[PDB]
């Protein structure tokens, strides 16, 4: 449970994280390397935002952002040799620390000519984040929120990745609680005002199972189906929530009141 002043620090950090995604958007084009995208992000964070990437060095992570293409579910490592191409779907997952507090958000970019199925998976995944956000208010259990995401996603013939989840966030990067995106008999966390955490559903076109690669980081779908993710950092309010990482292109308001 964060203090008013700490919540303010989270607004600042969350805005910065959102702004990295706004900044990078025009660079997300056929032909660019994920390596360069990462350099551009890191330069912006250090030099213009006077912040730091939370990811760089975190538990040994080598880069400043995670960039995940098509069948890669999460933790794609920027690389100078990996070029974006027409029809790709790409997640850029950003976390910045500013004044001791973390802001954590990601979105999908569609590269070149969108494919109908890429467009669909991306839209449905964002909608699954959106429906979750509209549920958030004190007195609700996280279990219900995980359950609703799962129900929505699967009704689309998609699946929810189980190995990854949203999380409490503040002066730490991945704090309690775990925010599962599916119904779990383990989840029992009733929301309270001032809690800050993320919601970050990872949705596969095919089966839920994943595979980790040999670089200690990159995760793909076991069946090599497409996978998409969107993420926001939020604070629970008296009556709902406030999205700390909102972007210009978000089709949901910052403050959600009940
Ligand atoms: C820093 S990171 O964005 O690459 N993410 C992570 C790093 C290290 C450990 C993690 C565990 C769960 C989820 N994300 C993790
Ligand atoms: Mn991560
Ligand atoms: Mn993230
Ligand atoms: Mn996160
Ligand atoms: Na993907």
From Swiss-Prot:
Annotated EC: 3.4.11.18
CDD domains: MetAP1
Gene3D superfamilies in the cross-refs: Creatinase/methionine aminopeptidase superfamily (3.90.230.10)
Binding site for a divalent metal cation 2: 104, 167, 200, 231
Keywords noted in UniProt: Aminopeptidase, Hydrolase, Metal-binding, Protease
Binding site for substrate: 75, 174
Uppermost EC category: hydrolase
Cofactor comment: Binds 2 divalent metal cations per subunit. Has a high-affinity and a low affinity metal-binding site. The true nature of the physiological cofactor is under debate. The enzyme is active with cobalt, zinc, manganese or divalent iron ions. Most likely, methionine aminopeptidases function as mononuclear Fe(2+)-metalloproteases under physiological conditions, and the catalytically relevant metal-binding site has been assigned to the histidine-containing high-affinity site.
Residues noted as binding a divalent metal cation 1 in the record, renumbered to the chain: 93, 104, 231
Biological role stated in the UniProt entry: Removes the N-terminal methionine from nascent proteins. The N-terminal methionine is often cleaved when the second residue in the primary sequence is small and uncharged (Met-Ala-, Cys, Gly, Pro, Ser, Thr, or Val). Requires deformylation of the N(alpha)-formylated initiator methionine before it can be hydrolyzed.
Family under the similarity heading: Belongs to the peptidase M24A family. Methionine aminopeptidase type 1 subfamily.
Protein name: Methionine aminopeptidase
Organism (species): Escherichia coli O157:H7
């Amino acid at each position: 449970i964060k203090t008013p002043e700490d919540i303010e620090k989270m607004r600042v950090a969350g805005r910065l994280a959102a702004e990295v995604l706004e900044m990078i958007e025009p660079y997300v084009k056929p032909g660019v390397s994920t390596g360069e995208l990462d350099r551009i992000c890191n330069d912006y964070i250090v030099n213009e935002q006077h912040a730091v990437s939370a990811c760089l060095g975190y538990h040994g992570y080598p880069k400043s952002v995670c960039i995940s293409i098509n069948e890669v579910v999460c933790h794609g490592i920027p690389d100078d040799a990996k070029l974006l191409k027409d029809g790709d779907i790409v997640n850029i997952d950003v976390t910045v620390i500013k004044d001791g507090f973390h802001g954590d958000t990601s979105k999908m970019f569609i590269v070149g000519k969108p494919t109908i199925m890429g467009e669909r998976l991306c839209r449905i995944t964002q909608e699954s984040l959106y429906l979750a956000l509209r549920m958030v208010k004190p007195g609700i259990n996280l279990r219900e929120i995980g359950a609703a995401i799962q129900k929505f996603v699967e009704a689309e013939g998609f699946s929810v990745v189980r190995e990854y989840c949203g999380h409490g966030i503040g002066r730490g990067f991945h704090e309690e609680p775990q925010v599962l995106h599916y119904d779990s008999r383990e989840t029992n966390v009733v929301l309270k005002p001032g809690m800050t955490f993320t919601i970050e559903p990872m949705v596969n076109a095919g089966k839920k199972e994943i595979r980790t690669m040999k670089d200690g980081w990159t995760v793909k779908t076991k069946d090599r189906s497409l996978s998409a993710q969107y993420e926001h950092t939020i604070v629970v309010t008296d009556n709902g929530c406030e999205i700390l990482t909102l972007r210009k292109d978000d089709t949901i308001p910052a403050i959600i009141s009940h």
